[PDB]
Amino acid sequence: EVETFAFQAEIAQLMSLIINTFYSNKEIFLRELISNSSDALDKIRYESLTDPSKLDSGKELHINLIPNKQDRTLTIVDTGIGMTKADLINNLGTIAKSGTKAFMEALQAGADISMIGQFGVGFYSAYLVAEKVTVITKHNDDEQYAWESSAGGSFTVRTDTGEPMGRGTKVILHLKEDQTEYLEERRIKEIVKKHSQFIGYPITLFVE
């Protein structure tokens, strides 16, 4: 069933900085996740060009943003490439060890925290708003996995069967108490218009 792993010391530190550095432009987290979703979708398009069969698991290439005010979660879903157990475990397929280092080198020399994603580690910006992140994923070459973390130094991976998802990645953000603004329809619309306005894939904003 559940496996628990430690974050590489460096990522544990990056996460820590995000959680513990005072920085109020928290909204950028949405841009960064949306920007991973876009890339993930880029990858599935790229392979499909040579191999139509890769989109047997779904033809549509899009992003859903799903607020749920009851559970207090913001879910970002794509039908992009997904991650294998191994990518999941390895820093969710980022070059996070090298990218973290640079980011901090770059932080000492005039970079703010919103530059995070220029270092390939935008994912962790989730922790600006989220107390706990669950990432469900399905890659064509593997089964469905759930990854989970509330920082603290550890993450867990387990396989996942409650609802198959064909192909893609579902980043579930359980918001901190004081961050429920990110569940308001007008706040999400404003953010998407302001930071992810022009992007290669449709974004549906679910209503409640």
123 is in an annotated binding site: yes
Resolution of this entry in Å?
2.5
Which experiment gave this structure? X-ray
Residue 80 and residue 44 in contact, taking contact as beta carbons nearer than 8 Å: yes
Q: How many alpha carbons lie under 13 Å from residue 34 in its C-beta half-sphere? A: 25
Q: Which of 87, 109, 107, 82 is nearest to 171 (CA)?
A: 82
Neighbour tally for 143: CB within 10 Å: 13
Cα(14)–Cα(106) distance, integer angstroms: 13
For residue 153, CA distances in Å to 11, 97, 111 come to 9, 15, 25
All structural domains of the chain, each given as residue ranges with its CATH number in brackets, are 1-208 (3.30.565.10)
78 is in an annotated binding site: yes
112 is in an annotated binding site: no
69 is in an annotated binding site: no
Provide the 3-class DSSP secondary structure of residue 4.
Answer: strand
